[PDB]
Amino acid sequence: XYXXXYX
Amino acid sequence: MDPETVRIALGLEERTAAWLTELDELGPPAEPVRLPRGEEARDLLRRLEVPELDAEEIVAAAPDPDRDPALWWLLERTHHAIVRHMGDHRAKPRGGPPLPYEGGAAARYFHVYVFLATVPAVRRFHAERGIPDEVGWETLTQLGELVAIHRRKYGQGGMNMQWWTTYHLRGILYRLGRLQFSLATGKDGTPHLGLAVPEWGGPLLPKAYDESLHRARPFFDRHFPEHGARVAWGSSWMLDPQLEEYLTEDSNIIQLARFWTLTDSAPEPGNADGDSSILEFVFRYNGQPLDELPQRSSLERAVIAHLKAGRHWHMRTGFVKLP
Numbered sequence: 001x002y003x004x005x006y007x
Numbered sequence: 008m009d010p011e012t013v014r015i016a017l018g019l020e021e022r023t024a025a026w027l028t029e030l031d032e033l034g035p036p037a038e039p040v041r042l043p044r045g046e047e048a049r050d051l052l053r054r055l056e057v058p059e060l061d062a063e064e065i066v067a068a069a070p071d072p073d074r075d076p077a078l079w080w081l082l083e084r085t086h087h088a089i090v091r092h093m094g095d096h097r098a099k100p101r102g103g104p105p106l107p108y109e110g111g112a113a114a115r116y117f118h119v120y121v122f123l124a125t126v127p128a129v130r131r132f133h134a135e136r137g138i139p140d141e142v143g144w145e146t147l148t149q150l151g152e153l154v155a156i157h158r159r160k161y162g163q164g165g166m167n168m169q170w171w172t173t174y175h176l177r178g179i180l181y182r183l184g185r186l187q188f189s190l191a192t193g194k195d196g197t198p199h200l201g202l203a204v205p206e207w208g209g210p211l212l213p214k215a216y217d218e219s220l221h222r223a224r225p226f227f228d229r230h231f232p233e234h235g236a237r238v239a240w241g242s243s244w245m246l247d248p249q250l251e252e253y254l255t256e257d258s259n260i261i262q263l264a265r266f267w268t269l270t271d272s273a274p275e276p277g278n279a280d281g282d283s284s285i286l287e288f289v290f291r292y293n294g295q296p297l298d299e300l301p302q303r304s305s306l307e308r309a310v311i312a313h314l315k316a317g318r319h320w321h322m323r324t325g326f327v328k329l330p
């Protein structure tokens with residue numbers, strides 16, 4: 001995890 | 008210039024090529040990019056709650072079309088790539104890559120420049136929707152929080168959460184007191200409000216939480232009447248019922264999570280996914296040794312304890328009906 005989004 | 012020149016001048020990785028091609032395709036914005044300078048820039052920065060130390064460095068390093076051609080090229084197209092989706096919550100949050108720090112202060116603060124260059128457009132969008140000025144400004148001040156966080160986390164000036172600021176700058180997320188709400192849509196297209204909790208603003212007191220919840224429906228029904236959400240949805244380490252092992256009944260998180268209805272299945276215990284999320288938000292974790300992290304609060308102790316015990320944290324999802 002550690003990246004964000006939301007897709 | 009062309010995508011490959013820009014990519015190479017800036018030291019951007021080869022995976023960014025498609026993005027750079029897409030920005031090339033899109034071209035420069037109709038309204039030319041303008042950066043505020045001097046005391047104009049200082050007033051805007053201060054209004055957006057950027058710490059004085061960073062603001063001063065931001066103004067000193069502001070890039071220039073002639074000396075910084077590759078950077079300027081990217082600045083205009085990145086700006087354009089954001090405004091073309093103004094008001095559009097169905098578009099993905101693409102802020103563009105971070106710039107290698109070998110480019111110096113203008114590279115470190117690149118997405119701050121994008122944000123400042125985009126303020127007039129979103130403020131126009133706010134005006135068109137009838138958003139009160141105080142709501143508009145209060146929403147945009149997360150820039151300051153995100154700048155300050157970069158410095159805490161890494162020790163020098165920057166802002167590397169540009170994917171997140173695409174929400175503020177598209178006019179799809181608003182801070183309404185202690186909580187933020189974004190225009191959002193489930194997999195089946197059903198409208199809801201995404202709920203987020205900014206760091207600045209103090210503890211998540213039940214009264215401040217409940218005032219924010221009361222503001223959501225009337226705000227969105229007035230200014231975005233076509234959206235029609237009845238429900239706020241959240242995904243967060245804060246919704247992990249495992250916190251109940253460690254925090255007391257006075258905990259704001261424990262008290263407030265009791266109103267939430269979780270809609271995801273119990274996670275596999277070996278699932279180590281929510282681990283990086285809780286470490287970011289509690290510690291702004293950046294690769295360092297675990298017993299080296301502070302242990303001042305019950306939550307700081309909790310997070311490490313559980314992880315030391317060989318156990319995992321999970322991001323849980325749920326909803327609350329809008330009052």
Ligand SMILES: CC(C)(COP(=O)(O)OP(=O)(O)OC[C@H]1O[C@@H](n2cnc3c(N)ncnc32)[C@H](O)[C@@H]1OP(=O)(O)O)[C@@H](O)C(=O)NCCC(=O)NCCS
Nearest residue numbers: 204205206209210211243258259260288289304305306307
């Ligand atoms: C959201 C937030 C404001 C809530 O704080 P809070 O209201 O104080 O939460 P609680 O009342 O449950 O706090 C319980 C304990 O943990 C401590 N604590 C809470 N949040 C903490 C944090 N982010 N870092 C360190 N300690 C924290 C509290 O000081 C308290 O300590 P004590 O029992 O030793 O007195 C806070 O966690 C925060 O600012 N987080 C960053 C933003 C965030 O996580 N947002 C959600 C992203 S999905």
Ligand SMILES: *[C@@H]1O[C@H](CO)[C@@H](O)[C@H](O)[C@H]1NC(=O)CCCCCCCCC
Nearest residue numbers: 171202203204241242243245260263264
């Ligand atoms: C998502 O990440 C960005 C990047 O830093 C943050 O700025 C947001 O704050 C993050 N979102 C999160 O806050 C969701 C919280 C919803 C939880 C609802 C439970 C509230 C009651 C305990």
Ligand SMILES: *[C@@H]1O[C@H](CO)[C@@H](O)[C@H](O)[C@H]1NC(C)=O
Nearest residue numbers: 006007189191192193201202
């Ligand atoms: C992320 O996007 C998804 C759907 O596209 C939505 O479920 C969720 O609420 C969004 N988060 C925010 C904060 O907008």
Ligand SMILES: *[C@H]1O[C@H](CO)[C@@H](O)[C@H](O)[C@@H]1O
Nearest residue numbers: 003004005006007099101
């Ligand atoms: C989620 O998937 C999207 C799909 O494009 C990626 O952009 C992102 O990096 C993450 O893996």
